[PDB]
Design a protein around this ligand. Sequence first.
Ligand SMILES: Nc1ncnc2c1ncn2[C@@H]1O[C@H](COP(=O)(O)OP(=O)(O)O)[C@@H](O)[C@H]1O
Length: 328
Amino acid sequence: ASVKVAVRVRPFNSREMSRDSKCIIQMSGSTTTIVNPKQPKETPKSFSFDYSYWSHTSPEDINYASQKQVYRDIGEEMLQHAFEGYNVCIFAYGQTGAGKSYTMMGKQEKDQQGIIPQLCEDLFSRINDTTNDNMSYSVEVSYMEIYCERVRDLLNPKNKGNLRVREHPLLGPYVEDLSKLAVTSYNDIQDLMDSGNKPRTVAATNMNETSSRSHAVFNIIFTQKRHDAETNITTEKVSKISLVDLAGSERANINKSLTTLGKVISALAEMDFIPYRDSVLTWLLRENLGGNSRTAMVAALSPADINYDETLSTLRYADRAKQIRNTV
Ligand SMILES: Nc1ncnc2c1ncn2[C@@H]1O[C@H](COP(=O)(O)OP(=O)(O)O)[C@@H](O)[C@H]1O
């Protein structure tokens, strides 16, 4: 199953408006076109993706791509696979301030909530709508940050241990002693999500906002138990959902995981060895990038002329990822 890829351009932001930036991005169907502001004499480069989301204007536009479309397209599709019994993964990629957090977390208001909130909500809604008493559920969550190769429990900032990433001799990679909490309602999960968001590492270089060098991985362990009065054995289906918000693509080493992710994606796109263990990110996400899992990428794009190089680079790496195929 191919890694599905979407790209999304946001409206100008303060930095761009202050330099009178023009828009160098265009979309139509599933195709995204980028113009080169420095060399207007060349022909615009175009890429095609599963989805090319135009969110450059405002929800008052008939053509604005809303947090709801985005989720109903890729988010919903993955949740359904999770229910099928498939592990899934969605990660946001892009230059700092491109729109990664907004797309993944968004803002809890004006129906401005991103993929994570909507998926969690959608998930409990479905669970509570079950009418077959032979089915019972379990939902566990974990939330971590990876900053400079260091892993931190975001749901338990009451422990400074930089959790160690271990390779289980038989079951794969796992963060040692990372808290896994049972949640029985959307409100509860959303509270953990909220506290977790504040625990994230900040940086003075970012005006003390969340460091553009931290990766956040939100995981859900969805267990389905199906019982039937007969032989009396309850069968179990366990799906792991990984929702990832990555550090800026160009915003014990600072950029190891991101550079390594790039190599792993290129390698995988070419292949169809891979340096998974070269970084904690690619190591933990090994099975989501080539392994047994349905996966998707959402690449955030700045629409500004001043970010051409970084945006072209994001489009290129997104184009690559489109060629990856996992073995599920
Ligand atoms: N689709 C969108 N609709 C509206 N505003 C957006 C959209 N994408 C990005 N933005 C705006 O851009 C800013 C930066 O996106 P953000 O998610 O914070 O950055 P990053 O990619 O570094 O995580 C936000 O403060 C938000 O107001």
